[PDB]
Amino acid sequence: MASMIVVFVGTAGSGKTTLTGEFGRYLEDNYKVAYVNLDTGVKELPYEPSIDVREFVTVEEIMREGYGPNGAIVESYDRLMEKFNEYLNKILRLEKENDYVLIDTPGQMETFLFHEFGVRLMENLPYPLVVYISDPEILKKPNDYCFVRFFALLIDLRLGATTIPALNKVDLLSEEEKERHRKYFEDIDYLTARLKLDPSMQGLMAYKMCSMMTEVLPPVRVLYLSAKTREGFEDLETLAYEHYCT
Amino acid sequence: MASMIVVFVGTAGSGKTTLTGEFGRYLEDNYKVAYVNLDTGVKELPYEPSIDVREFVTVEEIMREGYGPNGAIVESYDRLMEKFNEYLNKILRLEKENDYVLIDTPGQMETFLFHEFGVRLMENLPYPLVVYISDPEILKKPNDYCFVRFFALLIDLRLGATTIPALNKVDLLSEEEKERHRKYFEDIDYLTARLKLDPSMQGLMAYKMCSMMTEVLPPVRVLYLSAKTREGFEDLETLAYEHYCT
Ligand SMILES: Nc1nc2c(ncn2[C@@H]2O[C@H](COP(=O)(O)OP(=O)(O)O)[C@@H](O)[C@H]2O)c(=O)[nH]1
Ligand SMILES: Nc1nc2c(ncn2[C@@H]2O[C@H](COP(=O)(O)OP(=O)(O)O)[C@@H](O)[C@H]2O)c(=O)[nH]1
Ligand SMILES: [Mg+2]
Ligand SMILES: [Mg+2]
């Protein structure tokens, strides 16, 4: 009815499948929800998918053809393209009968960013919203913050869909960490400022870069989520609905 | 002696291992050369590596512990971190006894961009040069060009190493294709110009972005290489040496 699509994008250990699971249940209180799994090499799902590409191809079976692991992943998404139109249509249909279609993407994001299947699928859905989750562990140095927010800018460019930067597993944060990440993230002044202290080509090649005063809506609002405590779920829901309007 | 390190970074089908192989042989005419393989899930190497992390861990063996393919790749680079110092030192030593250390990276670049092993290793080598190869197939639309050159900008930010944008397998190009890619790439005027024709949020969110007039050395020189004809090898060699100076 409301027909929103939310695509979770992240690398290994970001926890996006658990998030897709739990954020669904959260939504299943006030909304009809659909689950789509595009990962051909995930062992188990904590939700019940209306679409599961493992039903057509899996990485493990393909490897049992003599493919290397890197080669079976790529080859698994080559075979999916034979069922491109089907899935696009499976998805478009689901989107007509639901408030939310949650799309769980390949564990290796480059399989989604670089392969025809993921790229073309995206191109052909109406205004999908993308949520890019990062493992807060990566957030050790000041450049790490600029990168996260640049990567989300690309995903946007590559998939042509608004992309929301998010940290997940924030329940594991000491709260000092919690303190530290927000500062760099929300206080654009703080971040840029700090980037000068680096006397290095990367402290120097990395400062002119966080040009917030650029683009349009230069700065993006970073969500902090937790599958575990349902932190930030209402923000995301508010962000979905609001993207659906604008 | 000259001690240069060249790190090949690219996704599946970009051909970087074949490139690392052949560009070595090309160098093995006028130089001493070392090969380092950081990919724990590659089936076979066309070169003789002085360092091979498959000798310590492989993705396939790890999966035979009940790990999913996505989970065995990540777990393979977690175990490598136990031998971090060793490899750093293996590498630093090789770099002292050779003109060139060629570093062949994990087939999935995010394993290199997001995992501690790849990120920390990079941080700890002297001014390595990174070569980001893309499959020219991805080069279908005008935004595809901006993205390639943005991704290389990140790799730079993430790894803190100068990153050279390259197309590979250019021998497969019809020459019309060859015509088309260079125009978008080298003629900065052409590219930006074209990006306006898009009346879309992505033709609109994708134009203010290719800000060449920004950064420092805003525009980067894109190499066109071929393992097959040795196209562009002299450019790269010229680019290595020149990065070694500057
Ligand atoms: N503490 C905590 N753990 C989480 C959270 N989200 C996921 N996890 C755990 O992280 C691990 C990886 O999650 P998963 O969603 O399967 O990873 P994915 O491959 O990115 O989809 C699982 O053991 C989850 O239980 C979270 O918000 N908080
Ligand atoms: N025509 C052509 N084929 C190439 C070139 N480089 C690699 N290949 C082929 O592309 C395939 C994948 O190459 P490989 O280096 O193993 O892929 P990688 O996983 O990115 O390292 C192999 O069959 C190579 O023979 C090239 O420059 N030209
Ligand atoms: Mg998963
Ligand atoms: Mg390879």
Q: What is the DSSP string of A134-156?
A: E-GGG--SHHHHHHHHHHHHHHH
Q: Which atom of ligand 1 is nearest to the CA of A231?
A: 27
C-alpha to C-alpha distance for A201 and A117, rounded to whole angstroms: 37
Residue keyed to tokens 């999913």: B68
The beta-carbon contacts of A216-221 under 8 Å, at least 24 apart in sequence, are: A216/B204, A216/B205, A216/B208, A219/A188, A220/A149, A220/A152, A220/A163, A220/A164, A220/A165, A221/A164, A221/A165
Chain B residues with CB inside 8 Å of A154's CB? 147, 150-151, 154
**Cα of A198 vs its chain's centroid, Å:** 30
CA angle, A95 as apex, A92 and A100 as ends, to 5°?
150
CA of A139 to the centre of ligand 1 (A): 17
Residue keyed to tokens 């240069």: B4
Count other Cβ atoms within 10 Å, centred on residue A69. 28
**Sequence-ordered list of residues with C-beta below 8 angstroms from that of A195, at least 6 positions apart, any chain:** A142, A143, A146, A203, A206, A207, A210
A21 lines ligand 1 (CB under 6 A): no
C-alpha to C-alpha distance for A208 and A195, rounded to whole angstroms: 9
Counting ligand 1 atoms within 8 A of each CB, the residue from A18, A45, A223 with the most, and so the one to mutate, is A18
CA distances from A200 to A25, B3, B73, B144, B217 (A): 47, 21, 32, 30, 16
Instruction: Say whether B70 sits in a helix, a strand or coil.
Output: helix
Q: Is A196 annotated as a binding residue?
A: no
> Which of these, B119, B100, B120, B122, lies nearest to B47 by C-alpha position?
B100
Task: Say what angle helices A188-195 and A176-186 make with each other, to 10 degrees.
Answer: 90
Q: How was this structure determined?
A: X-ray
C-alpha to C-alpha distance for A138 and A134, rounded to whole angstroms: 8
C-alpha to C-alpha distance for A185 and A210, rounded to whole angstroms: 11
Q: Is B183 annotated as a binding residue?
A: no
C-alpha to C-alpha distance for B35 and B51, rounded to whole angstroms: 7
Write the single-letter amino acid at A124: N
Order the strands of the A4-9 sheet from edge to edge: A51-52, A33-37, A100-104, A4-9, A129-134, A163-167, A223-224
Name the DSSP class of B43: S
Domains in chain B, CATH or no CATH each: 4-246 (3.40.50.300)
Instruction: Please say whether the beta carbons of B229 and B171 come within 8 A.
Output: yes
> Which of these, A207, A166, A190, A171, lies nearest to A8 by C-alpha position?
A166
**Sequence-ordered list of residues with C-beta below 8 angstroms from that of B214, at least 6 positions apart, any chain:** A208, A211
The number of CA neighbours under 13 Å toward the Cβ of A174 is: 4
Q: Can you list the positions of beta strands (E) in A73-175?
A: 100-104, 129-134, 163-167
Alpha-carbon Rg for chain A in angstroms = 19
Q: At A31, give phi and psi (nearest 5°).
A: -160, 155
**Sequence-ordered list of residues with C-beta below 8 angstroms from that of A78, at least 6 positions apart, any chain:** A115
Instruction: Please say whether the beta carbons of B232 and B175 come within 8 A.
Output: no
Count other Cβ atoms within 10 Å, centred on residue B87. 19
The resolution in Å comes to: 2.4
- Please tell me which of the candidates A74, A146, A205 has its beta carbon nearest to residue B12: A74
> Which of these, A231, A243, A241, A245, lies nearest to A31 by C-alpha position?
A241
Count other Cβ atoms within 10 Å, centred on residue B125. 18
